[PDB]
Amino acid sequence: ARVTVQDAVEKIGNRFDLVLVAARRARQMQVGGKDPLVPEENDKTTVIALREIEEGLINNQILDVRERQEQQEQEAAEL
Amino acid sequence: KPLVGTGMERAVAVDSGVTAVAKRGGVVQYVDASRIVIKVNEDEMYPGEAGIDIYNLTKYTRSNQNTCINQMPCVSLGEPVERGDVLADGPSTDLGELAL
Amino acid sequence: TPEEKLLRAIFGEKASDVKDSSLRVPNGVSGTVIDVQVFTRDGVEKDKRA
Amino acid sequence: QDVVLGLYYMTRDCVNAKGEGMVLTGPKEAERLYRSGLASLHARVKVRIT
Amino acid sequence: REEAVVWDILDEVIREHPVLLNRAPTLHRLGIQAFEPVLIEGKAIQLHPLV
Amino acid sequence: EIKELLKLGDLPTSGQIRLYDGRTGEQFERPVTVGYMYMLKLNHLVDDKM
Amino acid sequence: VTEFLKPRLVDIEQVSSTHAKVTLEPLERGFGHTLGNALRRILLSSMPGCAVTEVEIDGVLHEYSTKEGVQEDILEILLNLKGLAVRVQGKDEVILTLNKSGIGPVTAADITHDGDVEIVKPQHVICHLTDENASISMRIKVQRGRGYVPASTRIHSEEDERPIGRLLVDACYSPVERIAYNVEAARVEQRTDLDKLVIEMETNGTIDPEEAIRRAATILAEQLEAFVDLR
Amino acid sequence: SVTEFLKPRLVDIEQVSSTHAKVTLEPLERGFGHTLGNALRRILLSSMPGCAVTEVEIDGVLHEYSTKEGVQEDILEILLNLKGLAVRVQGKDEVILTLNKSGIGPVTAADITHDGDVEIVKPQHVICHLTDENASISMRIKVQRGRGYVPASTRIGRLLVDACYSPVERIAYNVEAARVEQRTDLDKLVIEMETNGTIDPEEAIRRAATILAEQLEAFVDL
């Protein structure tokens, strides 16, 4: 779990952009078929989001390129 | 009662009408959680009069602030009372003193 | 609505013409009923409790 | 108020307090002495501090 | 009915879910702060001393 | 007069006794003012607040 | 140096029916306060005793009412019955009966005698009848238990909808009222560092001092098993 | 019934290191956290037996405020370093170790002469340092068996060391709230204990509880 978010704010250079990126990733994990990149230790999707931010596994650029990738793969099914 | 008080407890408890104060002195003919019957002394009764004072006690009624106001008889059966003696307590009253 | 109309059609429990507006104990309050008073308007017949 | 008073009372010194003058291997031995009642919380003492 | 299972559910739903506690007059922005709730059995909130 | 009444009841005239912790059984380091205060339950009850 | 002198229950001085001084001796230095406070914390919270849990008075529907002829309210009669010291041999529940008529104090000595139930203080005034035709008749459900159990934590324990007139009484089952202990020096056979623990003990009279020391030591020694194993 | 108490179901021993652990017992009855925690704490702290360096006799030193050249610290700090020397003695209650060393660098606890019935649990324990390559440190150390903490002030050539007999170095306990089936009033006992290395923490808690149960076994009913 998280008691202070200071490690995530050092990777994402703001608190407001941190809130936005973590809300986007937590909405991916909560309503959506996406799976966490860290072991879910009985945490809610907000804390799993912040723990993925803290480890450097997720930021706005990674989220954007992953969206581009899954959208291009879903559009690749031209049949 | 307060172990430390100022002496105004009795005045506050008696001058408020929460308690039952003997109008005429006498002897407690009958004491009961719902009423006190006082046999008035011969010195204090008028001619042509039964000479008995009945005090009906307020039991478990609602105050304005939804608390319980309830009068408990203080005297015992047969004991003598005087004019002005507290006969039944009120809410927040201990033997005629003000116990908040 | 049509869905509960079908629900009435399947199970058959016809809804009642009356609505429960009874007096209930407020939540959190727990105690003893110590008095009941019934005030009936003159002309209204008194129930067994009154 | 309570916290400041606790930390002030703990961190004061008394002159001839119980257990004055001994030399301790560190903070853990000081806690041992205090809890064992072998030294008072104000005894001026010599502690090996890292 | 407050069954015994809704209390386990309630322990689940508040786990990492902050709540905002506010004491009016909110004179400055520290008059609203978030906290993770710990379910207690009283009827009074237990506010940490340092805040 | 309060100290004279405390002496009459065989009490410490300073109004302070030594207490012991209930959980650990060890004596509080200073005498504590113990006595009888007349407490009042005020009508601001947490049942009516929550 | 690795062996300890173990205490024995040396002396039990019965100061009163509800007072005692139990001497535990010898105690190696340091074990006086360890044992004394462990035993005090266990005695003061965990001793079993019987307490009145329900009352059923004859013509009474609820506590906030009065009976005619009785000087007390029904609520004051319930508070007078909550302090009924009673010890029950063999059962865990027994329904005593109190029937009484005429003027006078209804004390605990008017409770109808059972064979396996002993009223410790028979002078305990329960109520006062202030009329000669007045009569009280009630059934008092004494029950065995531990600690403090309020009636609002017993409104759920209901096999069936409890009748109107069974007045619940908040049960304080603990027999001990006050525990003190002193740790004095003892003199044992060429040794001077041995303590002696005098547990001064005040109860409602419904538990034996030796039996309560036995129960406290047993509760402690069976709670220490999770540490002696430590798996 | 009225004699059945809750006993700890969850026991999470967390070894933070070889000589420092955190035991967590849950759930206790309400108030038994403090009963058990303080009883075991008093026993571990004051009554648990062991062996400790009690006295030292150094050749050229007469009292703790004397001087010694060749060693880089006061005799006070040598006594402070011998106070922390943990040692197991198998057979006896009194052993005299000997430390004779000249050279350059630290004199660890591996420099003590090897007795047959003495185990130094940390041979790299720095006692003092030697600085000049012509001075020696030569002392007769006196390991004695006892229990608890016996400071040298009570025990008043030789230089008395505070005898830390008990194997524990720190013993703390917290009592937190614990719930079982909507009974939140239960206790949870978190013991944090560090020993000096002679025994692990779990053995120290086991030995303390054994000492307490053996004090009680004259009143207990089985």
Side-chain angles (χ1 to χ4, degrees):
Chain A
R2 294 297 286 248
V3 307
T4 172
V5 81
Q6 196 51 48
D7 285 332
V9 194
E10 291 166 353
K11 289 260 168 52
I12 290 180
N14 212 334
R15 276 183 190 258
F16 315 111
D17 304 282
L18 165 75
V19 159
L20 295 181
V21 173
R24 184 192 184 165
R25 173 62 187 163
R27 192 169 317 283
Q28 280 184 5
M29 286 181 304
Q30 169 194 70
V31 48
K34 294 199 191 44
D35 273 286
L37 301 158
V38 304
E40 168 202 336
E41 296 148 12
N42 200 3
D43 285 333
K44 291 187 180 297
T45 47
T46 51
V47 177
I48 308 163
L50 289 176
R51 288 164 55 220
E52 291 173 321
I53 301 289
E54 158 191 352
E55 300 190 17
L57 297 176
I58 287 294
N59 49 71
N60 202 20
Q61 182 180 23
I62 300 196
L63 283 179
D64 277 356
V65 306
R66 182 51 208 186
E67 174 195 64
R68 296 287 183 270
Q69 177 155 358
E70 73 164 10
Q71 188 194 2
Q72 276 163 9
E73 295 294 327
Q74 195 272 333
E75 292 292 327
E78 295 294 329
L79 308 95
Chain B
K1 75 194 161 323
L3 286 194
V4 193
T6 69
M8 284 275 308
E9 282 86 19
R10 301 206 162 268
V12 172
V14 165
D15 284 338
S16 79
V18 309
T19 181
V21 161
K23 293 182 288 265
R24 310 204 295 275
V27 171
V28 188
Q29 210 185 29
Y30 173 73
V31 64
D32 174 19
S34 82
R35 80 154 70 80
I36 299 169
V37 173
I38 297 285
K39 195 198 197 328
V40 187
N41 279 338
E42 267 288 332
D43 318 298
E44 311 192 6
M45 44 167 74
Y46 315 110
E49 174 206 357
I52 283 186
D53 289 330
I54 311 180
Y55 303 88
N56 291 302
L57 311 187
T58 285
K59 305 304 292 185
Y60 299 103
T61 74
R62 205 187 70 90
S63 70
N64 280 3
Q65 277 75 48
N66 282 326
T67 48
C68 179
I69 56 185
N70 167 53
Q71 294 189 308
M72 288 176 36
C74 194
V75 292
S76 55
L77 181 78
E79 81 166 44
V81 302
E82 267 163 334
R83 181 158 195 278
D85 272 17
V86 164
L87 284 189
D89 286 330
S92 282
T93 288
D94 194 1
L95 256 64
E97 296 185 25
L98 181 82
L100 303 177
Chain C
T1 175
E3 294 95 24
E4 54 195 80
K5 196 166 166 46
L6 166 67
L7 190 71
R8 297 322 173 123
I10 299 182
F11 302 142
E13 273 69 13
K14 295 182 289 294
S16 68
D17 46 347
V18 287
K19 187 181 63 83
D20 172 71
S21 191
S22 64
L23 171 68
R24 303 170 194 268
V25 192
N27 293 113
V29 177
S30 175
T32 286
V33 174
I34 64 171
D35 197 13
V36 171
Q37 289 170 348
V38 186
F39 313 98
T40 301
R41 166 175 316 285
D42 194 339
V44 175
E45 60 98 16
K46 302 193 190 138
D47 44 354
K48 289 176 48 187
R49 178 84 163 193
Chain D
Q1 50 201 55
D2 279 327
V3 188
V4 173
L5 177 69
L7 290 168
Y8 175 76
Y9 179 78
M10 158 165 44
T11 41
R12 280 202 48 172
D13 49 355
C14 195
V15 160
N16 206 36
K18 188 197 187 177
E20 195 201 18
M22 43 190 58
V23 187
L24 312 181
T25 44
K28 296 182 175 156
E29 189 175 317
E31 198 210 347
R32 264 193 281 156
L33 288 183
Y34 169 66
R35 296 317 279 253
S36 316
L38 289 157
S40 78
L41 196 62
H42 308 117
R44 287 181 282 116
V45 80
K46 264 172 159 299
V47 176
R48 170 186 280 152
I49 289 287
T50 299
Chain E
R1 299 186 306 249
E2 287 164 13
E3 319 211 343
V5 73
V6 309
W7 300 115
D8 296 330
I9 291 306
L10 181 54
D11 289 331
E12 267 188 0
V13 307
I14 71 145
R15 187 184 137 75
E16 321 267 342
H17 196 123
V19 300
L20 321 174
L21 264 64
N22 168 40
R23 184 190 160 273
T26 309
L27 287 172
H28 55 297
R29 82 182 208 195
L30 301 156
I32 299 191
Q33 288 169 60
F35 294 103
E36 307 196 333
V38 188
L39 287 202
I40 59 174
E41 278 218 59
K43 284 163 161 257
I45 310 169
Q46 278 179 339
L47 190 66
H48 194 284
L50 284 198
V51 313
Chain F
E1 283 150 275
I2 307 181
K3 299 208 177 196
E4 192 175 352
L5 203 50
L6 288 168
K7 203 166 313 179
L8 171 66
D10 290 322
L11 292 169
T13 77
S14 62
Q16 286 182 338
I17 59 179
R18 59 160 62 155
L19 296 174
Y20 301 81
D21 199 4
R23 327 187 288 187
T24 72
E26 62 204 2
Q27 164 204 311
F28 293 127
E29 303 186 4
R30 298 154 58 84
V32 187
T33 291
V34 188
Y36 279 82
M37 195 190 287
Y38 189 72
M39 298 303 263
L40 275 66
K41 183 199 176 158
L42 313 191
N43 209 10
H44 310 103
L45 279 76
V46 76
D47 290 274
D48 314 321
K49 303 300 173 210
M50 188 196 85
Chain G
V1 64
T2 60
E3 65 274 11
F4 293 89
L5 275 185
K6 302 175 187 178
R8 197 176 281 177
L9 201 67
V10 157
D11 171 70
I12 298 164
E13 169 196 336
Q14 193 83 57
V15 160
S16 175
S17 163
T18 68
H19 198 117
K21 287 188 164 62
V22 191
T23 295
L24 279 70
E25 161 199 324
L27 284 169
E28 287 272 17
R29 219 206 62 254
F31 282 99
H33 296 267
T34 316
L35 273 191
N37 199 59
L39 288 193
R40 167 177 197 284
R41 302 190 88 264
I42 293 152
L43 281 158
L44 214 64
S45 65
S46 295
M47 283 301 122
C50 316
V52 169
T53 49
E54 291 143 34
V55 185
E56 196 145 11
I57 317 178
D58 213 39
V60 167
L61 307 159
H62 58 284
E63 321 165 337
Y64 320 99
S65 66
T66 52
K67 203 177 176 66
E68 202 182 55
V70 187
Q71 183 162 352
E72 275 86 5
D73 296 326
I74 303 307
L75 190 54
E76 194 178 343
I77 289 163
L78 294 197
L79 302 180
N80 282 339
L81 275 166
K82 204 205 302 179
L84 198 71
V86 53
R87 59 187 305 161
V88 177
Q89 287 97 12
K91 314 189 160 318
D92 283 10
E93 175 191 292
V94 52
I95 302 196
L96 318 183
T97 300
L98 182 144
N99 309 307
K100 179 81 169 33
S101 289
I103 314 189
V106 178
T107 53
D110 305 346
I111 288 182
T112 300
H113 179 91
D114 291 335
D116 51 347
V117 162
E118 159 189 329
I119 311 295
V120 167
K121 187 171 57 173
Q123 313 98 22
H124 172 66
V125 165
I126 286 164
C127 81
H128 281 262
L129 305 172
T130 58
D131 185 18
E132 184 65 28
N133 280 66
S135 65
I136 203 168
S137 67
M138 88 176 81
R139 293 145 292 276
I140 317 168
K141 182 203 209 177
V142 164
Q143 202 169 2
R144 191 187 306 277
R146 214 181 59 215
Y148 177 49
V149 175
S152 62
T153 319
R154 261 184 289 125
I155 62 171
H156 74 84
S157 184
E158 270 184 40
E159 181 190 18
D160 284 316
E161 195 154 4
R162 178 168 42 82
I164 288 158
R166 266 193 204 180
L167 322 173
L168 293 184
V169 165
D170 309 80
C172 304
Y173 299 109
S174 168
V176 304
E177 312 291 330
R178 180 181 65 78
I179 302 276
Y181 66 94
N182 301 115
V183 184
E184 315 174 1
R187 336 283 165 182
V188 175
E189 277 66 25
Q190 300 292 321
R191 206 152 160 196
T192 79
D193 61 352
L194 293 186
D195 279 344
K196 161 183 70 179
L197 171 68
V198 181
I199 306 196
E200 165 202 337
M201 169 170 181
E202 162 182 298
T203 52
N204 64 345
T206 59
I207 198 162
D208 205 72
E210 173 164 355
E211 180 183 1
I213 295 301
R214 300 318 205 78
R215 291 184 186 272
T218 303
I219 294 162
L220 188 54
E222 89 189 12
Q223 292 293 289
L224 291 173
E225 277 172 4
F227 302 88
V228 181
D229 294 332
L230 210 64
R231 281 131 179 165
Chain H
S1 74
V2 310
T3 53
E4 293 295 328
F5 293 86
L6 272 81
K7 302 205 169 46
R9 292 296 100 199
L10 297 182
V11 184
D12 305 348
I13 319 177
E14 158 193 344
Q15 285 97 9
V16 191
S17 46
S18 53
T19 80
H20 168 36
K22 289 197 51 174
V23 184
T24 297
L25 304 101
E26 188 212 329
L28 280 309
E29 275 275 355
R30 188 201 66 179
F32 277 77
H34 281 299
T35 304
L36 298 173
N38 192 70
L40 297 176
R41 185 185 53 70
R42 296 189 95 265
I43 285 159
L44 286 154
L45 212 53
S46 302
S47 296
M48 200 164 162
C51 274
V53 166
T54 291
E55 302 162 13
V56 187
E57 293 166 7
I58 319 180
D59 43 352
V61 190
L62 294 174
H63 60 277
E64 61 179 358
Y65 298 105
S66 301
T67 186
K68 191 88 187 301
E69 71 272 16
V71 309
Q72 81 163 34
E73 57 205 11
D74 205 329
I75 308 301
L76 193 66
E77 211 164 8
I78 296 181
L79 298 179
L80 199 59
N81 285 288
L82 288 165
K83 193 212 282 210
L85 175 64
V87 46
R88 305 185 265 235
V89 175
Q90 298 304 116
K92 292 186 283 185
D93 282 9
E94 172 168 356
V95 173
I96 291 172
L97 314 179
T98 311
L99 173 54
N100 288 167
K101 174 77 175 303
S102 64
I104 287 298
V107 294
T108 54
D111 276 28
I112 295 173
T113 185
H114 186 72
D115 207 314
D117 59 321
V118 165
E119 309 200 89
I120 310 296
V121 311
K122 214 173 89 176
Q124 67 268 21
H125 186 57
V126 171
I127 294 180
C128 67
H129 299 256
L130 295 169
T131 67
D132 59 354
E133 183 62 30
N134 49 305
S136 192
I137 181 76
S138 163
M139 64 176 90
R140 279 153 313 280
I141 320 183
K142 176 162 162 174
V143 173
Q144 204 183 1
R145 191 180 311 264
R147 63 182 91 111
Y149 196 112
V150 179
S153 298
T154 74
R155 307 212 296 276
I156 291 160
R158 318 194 322 252
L159 294 91
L160 312 179
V161 190
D162 287 2
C164 303
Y165 296 120
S166 190
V168 310
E169 280 210 83
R170 190 183 104 97
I171 166 71
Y173 83 93
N174 311 301
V175 172
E176 310 183 1
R179 186 181 74 120
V180 160
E181 293 159 284
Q182 279 94 39
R183 317 166 43 174
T184 189
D185 51 312
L186 300 180
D187 276 7
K188 151 171 153 189
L189 178 55
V190 185
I191 297 173
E192 302 97 5
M193 193 176 48
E194 330 179 9
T195 54
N196 60 1
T198 45
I199 66 185
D200 41 347
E202 303 99 8
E203 195 58 35
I205 293 177
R206 287 198 260 274
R207 288 186 195 182
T210 293
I211 290 175
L212 191 47
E214 286 177 3
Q215 294 295 290
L216 293 155
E217 55 97 25
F219 327 126
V220 70
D221 303 334
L222 281 79

